[PDB]
Symmetry: C5
Subunit: 103 residues, 5 copies
């Protein structure tokens, strides 16, 4: 089991770490069908999604996907600093796999 | 995949964007049978609903409908500025499809 | 579909609007069997319940009853002003159907 | 149906009301198997549990047990004054049946 | 049934108590498949995980694991002082079994 987000991110293909060290600039969420997703942006312009659940996801991920959207909403509303994101870079917007908050 | 609320909204028939840039003026929710819904208003007089779940919705939307009502309640209570709403205009009140929030 | 709590309230028998324009004075909830309920009061003496889920409720109400208890708890803790309650007046305490909040 | 916690509490065998009129001093929760429970204390040394779900509990209590732990956690974190607890006194620590919050 | 975290912790093999008396320094969560987990750190560098649900868990733990991640996220965001953790020390990072919070 990994020790931190960077090492966790390295356990997967098609990923990279971004170091934001910043609060979320905007939070978007949709209930429209086939676009049940969240999008966040940061002041540096970067855009990220929580993907719509799909055939690529295994069942254990479904609750985690819901949790992540909960996290991002409350992080946005609390202006919590996001340290790093681990994202899949084979999707546009890049798709969030993990988040770290600190400081 | 769309990268913002405007482009997401334009992927559907009978939708449009409203630009509020304001906090929610009032939040209403009901548990009454056949009216399990939320209504929000803004100071400019705009009125929007989160629709009662029905057969027009696909199954993936159900969780997202519940999440949206969670989002609107907390946005109301935290006085978060709503940037945009994507709504369906073939319902009265217009029905919320997506929300964006920014400073 | 109604556009406000008063109009929604009028779509049911044995209801009435109470206008509070006040924060909740006390919040009570129970896990005891057959009394899985919430009770709120206001400083004017008014007492209201969220009913125990029962035979009178249709399936779609179950989630909304849980949400209403969530809403009342957080309204209480944040001292949010309650504008109106739509209540059924054929129960004692009167039973909450809907809530509106505004500053 | 009862209109307050004292009257509700009195509808059960082996219960009693504790009047605290104080915030929660500590909140403990466990995910350890067979100890999936919460324990709260007050500065006067009083200790109470939310019981591990068991065959004592009827089906309708299961959701309310989980809500109660949610309520205690957020009460703790908001420093909300707990007015009274209804507890079962045939368990050690005494087991929470209901809570009221008021100033 | 135990009356505090220390006593609860001692009801299990492969456990120990850490005394932090500090807020969480960082919160990390992941939705990546097979790594649906959370990791927290404290300012002294100590790292702890909420484990991915696995064969070792009994069914009653599944809700509690989800609750714990909820608790850690809100504790982090509120800067709530963690008193103690009970952890399994046969995993790395050490795996949280229970948490106590006190000011
Ligand atoms: C910690 C761990 O188990 N890591 C392993 C992961 C993992 O098992 C799967 O991602 C879980 O579904 O599977 C890895 C991985 O890198 O994703 N894997 C999986 C595969 C074949 C199938 C595959 O790529 N599945 C993941 C698809 C990705 O899903 C992601 C969501 O979870 C994203 O949507 C991403 O854009 C998509 O490409 N080849 N390698 C190998 C890696 O060692
Ligand atoms: C991104 C994407 O998939 N967009 C497509 C959507 C989408 O597949 C469905 O809305 C999902 O159920 O379906 C579109 C759409 O515009 O809604 N669509 C669907 C249909 C036939 C069935 C249909 O109209 N379904 C939507 C009904 C609408 O549901 C909405 C709630 O989700 C609202 O209640 C709205 O008032 C109602 O008219 N014709 N066009 C075509 C669009 O390209
Ligand atoms: C918008 C809408 O659909 N409104 C209709 C409602 C509604 O369909 C039901 O209340 C939903 O279960 O059903 C109405 C009503 O006023 O409740 N209705 C229902 C009936 C027969 C069955 C009936 O009385 N159901 C409601 C029972 C009430 O349930 C309530 C909880 O939802 C309360 O517990 C209340 O104390 C109880 O009397 N006769 N009229 C007629 C109303 O036009
Ligand atoms: C409002 C109401 O319905 N009150 C009634 C309750 C109630 O139906 C049950 O407690 C719900 O499970 O059942 C009462 C009660 O006092 O608990 N009851 C139940 C019984 C036989 C079964 C029984 O004792 N159930 C309660 C066991 C208690 O469960 C509790 C959790 O719910 C606690 O764990 C407690 O420590 C334990 O003794 N005898 N009396 C009679 C009481 O009139
Ligand atoms: C209060 C109580 O019932 N405590 C008992 C626990 C308990 O029943 C189980 O841990 C619940 O699954 O089972 C104890 C224990 O110490 O965990 N137990 C269990 C066993 C054999 C199987 C076993 O070790 N299960 C626990 C595995 C542990 O799961 C943990 C998560 O729950 C961690 O992942 C840990 O890293 C792992 O070793 N031997 N002793 C004996 C202890 O008296």
């Amino acid at each position: 089991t990994p020790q931190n987000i960077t090492d966790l991110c390295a356990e997967y293909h098609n990923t990279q770490i971004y170091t934001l060290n910043d609060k979320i600039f905007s939070y978007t969420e949709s209930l429209a069908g086939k676009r049940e997703m969240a999008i966040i942006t940061f002041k540096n312009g970067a855009i990220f999604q929580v993907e719509v659940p799909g055939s690529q996801h295994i069942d254990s991920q479904k609750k985690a996907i819901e949790r992540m959207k909960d996290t991002l909403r409350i992080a946005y509303l609390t202006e919590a600093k996001v340290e790093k994101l681990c994202v899949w870079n084979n999707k546009t917007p890049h798709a969030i796999a993990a988040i770290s908050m600190a400081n």
